[PDB]
Design a protein around this ligand. Sequence first.
Ligand SMILES: O=C(O)c1ccc2c(c1)N[C@@H](c1cc(C(F)(F)F)cc(C(F)(F)F)c1)[C@@H]1[C@H]3CC[C@H](C3)[C@H]21
Lengths: 212, 10
Amino acid sequence: DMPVERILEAELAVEDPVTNICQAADKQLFTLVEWAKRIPHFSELPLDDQVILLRAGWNELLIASFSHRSIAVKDGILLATGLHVHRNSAHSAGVGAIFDRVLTELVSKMRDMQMDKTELGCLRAIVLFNPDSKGLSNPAEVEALREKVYASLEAYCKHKYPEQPGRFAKLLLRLPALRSIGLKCLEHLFFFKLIGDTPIDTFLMEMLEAPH
Amino acid sequence: HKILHRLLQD
Ligand SMILES: O=C(O)c1ccc2c(c1)N[C@@H](c1cc(C(F)(F)F)cc(C(F)(F)F)c1)[C@@H]1[C@H]3CC[C@H](C3)[C@H]21
């Protein structure tokens, strides 16, 4: 069973600009592990599968979180360290294009539909339970968990926002943008690592290591 | 995966 109440509880429990952004990402990776443990049935997966899902999903999971945290911010993002970063500062640091994609495709769309924390948590749990992740011992089990999340999300949307029949589809259709933005952010991080001019802390660096 | 494994202990 996959109650939206548990998914919401998990969200509530865990609540150079590039250098600050990377520092916040390292900090949030620790919190991300604690979040995943609070998602129903994640901790009952084999340890190797928990590792695979987190290594596959961490960037999208963290992007979804900071995007939603930023819904009341004008033209900027709020990092988990408390620092607001405006798009002017991101442009001035050479990451303007990807930052504008975050604002236009994620933050602004979350704001305009007033995406709530239950919906965010369910989208994040869908991302976490990614049955396409390579190396999973039992992909069908992860697929089944994803199916329970989206069934619960749809029921939640139909009950809470009955006047918005397209809302569930609208939520799911931010996932391709999240996927593309995550991939582009990952390219940037690998580049910062290659250049060597941006401090990258130990957990963020481990996520940039090759898989076993 | 050293840090991640350690943080996933129960
Ligand atoms: O504070 C947080 O909750 C938090 C947690 C995690 C993160 C962040 C913020 N920032 C992300 C980010 C954003 C941009 C934006 F949005 F500003 F354009 C540009 C860049 C770039 F790589 F290009 F520098 C990187 C990093 C990347 C690793 C996991 C996510 C993605 C990570």
